Amino acid sequence: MAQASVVANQLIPINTCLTLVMMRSEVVTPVGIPAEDIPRLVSMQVNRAVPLGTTLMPDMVKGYAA
């Protein structure tokens, strides 16, 4: 696998705006939101709590479409 996805660097609470300290990049499987989109994602909100180490998926972010 060599494509990185956005991974939660901390528990991200429900309905909370995404900041850069909340998002790391990691090569994980299954593939989630591409790491190059971390820019785009700042200030978007998640629709569910995202535990530490979870891969951010498109359906978890309100208003995301790639």
Curated annotation (Swiss-Prot):
CDD domains assigned to the protein according to its UniProt record, in alphabetical order: Antifreeze_III
Keyword annotations of the record: Antifreeze protein, Secreted
Main subcellular location of this protein, as a coarse class: secreted
Site (Important for ice-binding): Q10, N15, T19, Q45
Tissues expressing the protein: Detected in blood serum (at protein level).
Domain AFP-like: 5-64
Disulfide bridge positions per record: none
Role noted for this protein: Contributes to protect fish blood from freezing at subzero sea water temperatures. Lowers the blood freezing point. Binds to nascent ice crystals and prevents further growth.
Family: Belongs to the type-III AFP family.
Protein name: Type-3 ice-structuring protein HPLC 12
